[PDB]
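Worked example 2:
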Amino acid sequence: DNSRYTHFLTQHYDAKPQGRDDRCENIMRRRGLTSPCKDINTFIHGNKRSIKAICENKNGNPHRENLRISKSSFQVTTCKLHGGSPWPPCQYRATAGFRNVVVACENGLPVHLDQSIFRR
């Protein structure tokens, strides 16, 4: 089941932000992360092939505990729940970012994004 890679794209890939401000509150609803309100979530932007390539040496190095780390940097956006309360309406602060990413590959497909690096 590639459903884990599928759930990855759904939680972490947005090919082109439209604009990356707080108005997070949308893509988090459009993506089904608001019951309960997902506390932090990051979208990678840009072309897929590139994010996919983190899955070999062509853009990836082993990291921590069997997680890969990208060699290149990606435009990224981090949505942080604001207000502390777990229930919609979900209000989010956006943070654009540009840096490399940490992921988990399984049979060469992304299936996880390590969110800790954006929690800062």
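The chain has one domain: 1-120. The radius of gyration is 14 Å.
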